[PDB]
Symmetry: D2
Subunit: 331 residues, 4 copies
């Protein structure tokens, strides 16, 4: 008698099961940028959104649903309860505490660990086979936390790491050379942010090593100060933060690129934070960024970059510092 049954004859009432589902936890500026980027790249058939602030969560969900006409992701759901995240192929963690003015980063990482304490078991309960992509900072430490709490094998726990750092690097290099960043190749590895390691030997266009072409590259004998490109990779992040309060658009796009490789089993190589024990001279359980092959099972393989002595020592120092701080985290 209703219009819907007058218009439409149902011939199979199967409960709908998602097949390419993505969950984003934390709907701040970063989570929503990941969300819109994943939606506009058609990477999911279902998107779930989780936060603890219920009205903002519901409003962001509704705002996306109102753009359904223009998308190809037919189901967008949200809620504070994690039943909405069930059977996600990929869970992306962008949640974190709001830093208060004058607050110590030392205090802040424990507050983010405490958040992860609640989030990770809930994610695991409802998506035991999902891949975890950790974006929240400090991302290398938090990816280790996520790995420990979840009990997942290391291939399924991935930190955003230096993927964004390397994208900034290629942007800046492209600005210097007058070439699209796609054609400027260069790798920033190790810790996300201040302590990242530029691998000068690998910087190239068309397979032409800039370092070989210009041996003073990365030194203080470099008349053009190309080391400043890596200083600017770090400083431009702080400048964005200073100018608009936070960063969001570039990390969103870089996360979607990662999601693309995982969701479509592409086996592209990206610089992401992975559990690096037993490689590159690391003897402890820590996560640092190295080139990783990304696909349907997460990190199936990584690339062993040859590093200088200087670059190796910086990685090992990062590893030591990460391990020592992690041993002081309260789980």
């Amino acid at each position: 008698a209703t219009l819907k049954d007058q218009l439409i004859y149902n011939l199979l009432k199967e409960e709908q099961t998602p097949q390419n589902k993505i969950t984003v936890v934390g709907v701040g500026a970063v989570g929503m940028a990941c969300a819109i980027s994943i939606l506009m790249k058609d990477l999911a058939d279902e998107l779930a959104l989780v936060d603890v602030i219920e009205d903002k969560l519901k409003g962001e969900m509704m705002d996306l649903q109102h753009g359904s006409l223009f998308l190809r992701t037919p189901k967008i759901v949200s809620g504070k309860d994690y039943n909405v995240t069930a059977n996600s192929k990929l869970v992306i963690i962008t949640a974190g505490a709001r830093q208060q003015e004058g607050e110590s980063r030392l205090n802040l990482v424990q507050r983010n660990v405490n958040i992860f304490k609640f989030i990770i078991p809930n994610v695991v309960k409802y998506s035991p086979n999902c891949k975890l992509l950790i974006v929240s900072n400090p991302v290398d430490i938090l990816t280790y936390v996520a790995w420990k709490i979840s009990g997942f094998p290391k291939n399924r726990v991935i930190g955003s790491g230096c993927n964004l750092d390397s994208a900034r690097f290629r942007y800046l290099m492209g600005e210097r050379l007058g070439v699209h960043p796609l054609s400027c190749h260069g790798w920033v590895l190790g810790e996300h942010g201040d302590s990242s390691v530029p691998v000068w030997s690998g910087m190239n266009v068309a397979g032409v090593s800039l370092k070989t072409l210009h041996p003073d590259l990365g030194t203080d004998k470099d008349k053009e100060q190309w080391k400043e490109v890596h200083k600017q990779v770090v400083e431009s992040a702080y400048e964005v933060i200073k100018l608009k309060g936070y960063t969001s658009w570039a990390i969103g796009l870089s996360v979607a690129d990662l999601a693309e490789s995982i969701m479509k089993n592409l086996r592209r190589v990206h610089p992401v934070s992975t559990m690096i024990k037993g490689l590159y001279g690391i003897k402890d359980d820590v996560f640092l960024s190295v080139p990783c092959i990304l696909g349907q099972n997460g990190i199936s393989d990584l690339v062993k970059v040859t590093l200088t002595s200087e670059e190796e020592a910086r990685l090992k120092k990062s590893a030591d510092t990460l391990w020592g701080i992690q041993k002081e985290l309260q789980f």
Copy 2:
């Protein structure tokens, strides 16, 4: 002798000239949502951003630039000076002031008028042949204001209008019927927001009229309450505003859909606000949403929807109301 010259032989020094350039004025949540959606749909070879808040403007520009690796838009610029907007094909106006504590809406519209009196002359000086897409609210009033200041012919002054309302309507229609909104068809015309007009006679799936199938559609006698579907088109917008403070993603996606038809000369039909004097019985210079054919010259044609007497009398009342405000706006 520089690294750049050792690597690259230059054979051509030709001034770069953008071919598919889009400017967004106002980098609030709405302007930036338009920007990211336009960027991810590859609609522009150059994007320019303008605002009066200089640090926020530079930070948003830089944040987009850092994701250049993942985009196909090779140049992103910004500035408070409109020389960065020169020779835009399309300029999208998302600038406005913010209501103060208990500020009157009539006083707020005049403040937005004062803003357009600065913006529009500056746009026209640098892109005298662009199309203007007005998004700021009240959008039908402000589209007329932009038209009168610009001196543009009506085909190149377009108000976002009911494109978003209609998209919300199809999401809500689709939720009732269990059908993707792309396959749900239905038009909301007239003013954006409170006074919009649902055209029940046009509501259909597979060319099957719901109204002819269910003659109570749109009436108060209807026990299925299909009028609520249009009530939700207005109410769900106020609810998003209440829940997250503003709306952004849906308007950004819908503006990008409009930009796509314009920039690709698609001649798709969209409900947008256009100077409607001489149609639907209206005799004053006002802008209201009707179905418009959109392409490289803006609005080249419009669809003459048959309206009932009730629907037609709502368009007339809206026109009279718009006319009465505009005569008392100072610009």
Copy 3:
């Protein structure tokens, strides 16, 4: 000691389980146009090709693989043995025998049944849960054949049907009106080919029914001859065959559009051939195109289009024809 192990460290050694796999059976012009459109829409994570001409099958596969740099489908395989098709979500049948000089449709129809008698068991063997998409002609008859041999439920056997006929309808309509085909709405139903049925009541732009505007529309007394559009729907296909020997691009694109809704669970509405017994006054097991809601389970629902007596009578006449031909098929 090898280069591969020197450069790459393997952490995961897990078998490759395909996730969004598509098979195309028959790599003639139609099968390869479906293949390229599927590849360029990023619809599959693995594409499988099958034919009985082994040289042509390998050359097509290798040609596609040589373009892998520009695609997002990392696995393309081919084989005469159906183990390569295992665990497909969607299996597309574009296979058929080549018409000889002087042979009629009634000489060739059984040759294609012989084809389907070999294909369909091997397909069902290695992908028991796949959705079947029948493109081969006579498409309505062959979908019945596939349905009977497969033993699949009616929701999982889809005939390409009048999807292409309707696409041509909307192109021709848009040509007359100067509107993009996307904004021109119109439905050709029933049999693919000569006996297809245009639903005049469904033709509209912006929800404005052309029939109401123009009562003679679809009649012989039409001074504007709007019946000729459907005549051209049929004649344009013969004209393309006469001119280039066959048709391939438009059917390729329409098949990829169908695949999109199925693989992404969009629940869009398309005119496709489905087992219509018990609906639309049909009383025999025959496949005719009606608007079907397409998703992860195939046809989960269909739209009940209200027909005129003339349109309904022709649907029964088609149903009578198919059933009488089907009684003469050798299984």
Copy 4:
């Protein structure tokens, strides 16, 4: 009284001027593969087709046109008269003769030259500022012939060259490494096809030089015989030709990739054929593939790849062979 006029009110009837128009001359398998690939990447607002076979030309045009519902390119035109190509931004030449049974290859090149003597002045006539992308074989010779006939500056005459050979190289490299070809970097330079030169020093994943890890890379004394990978770049093409009669899909995709850089002004680096006189040690007016920066003015820059002694000598010997042949041709 006309239905279109009752339905649609026209506000401007300005003449349509296409803004991002691409022409493809030659609608064989290669030209049509270029068309569909360009169509599915939305690179053009108008696509023009030219051939001498008038029936085949019209049928391909119509076949594409019937898929307009699924495309974002509103105008598809064709004709034997170059009027339809007017104001193309990009003209792609895929025209050529069929070698008669036992026809000497040198007599065949003259015949393709005679084709170009007809095509190129007609192209220049109707699109004097277009970029010319030459695909027909022998492509390096014919690109020179197009440049000499057209009178165009070097930056606007581009041969497809080794862009396809390098895509094949990266595919083969990726299959050996278990990595997506996108992340496999490697450059094939010089002549298209048999005499192409692999640049082993450029081969890398994540900036890790395979030559530095595995010094035997490219030698005859190579344990793993990586020289076969370049040999397979050449033999795989002949194999596709032998197996299916011709190659089409991969060249179509590579050409669409070049078009994307040119039409969007990306300044990506591609190995394409360019007038190499005065560079890489060459003294003759010949075209050879080097890494070129591609944008809205064609080739504005190229990368100066450091070559080993024998790569440089093979490139010098290729220039010598092309010049001697270009001396034997009449145009």
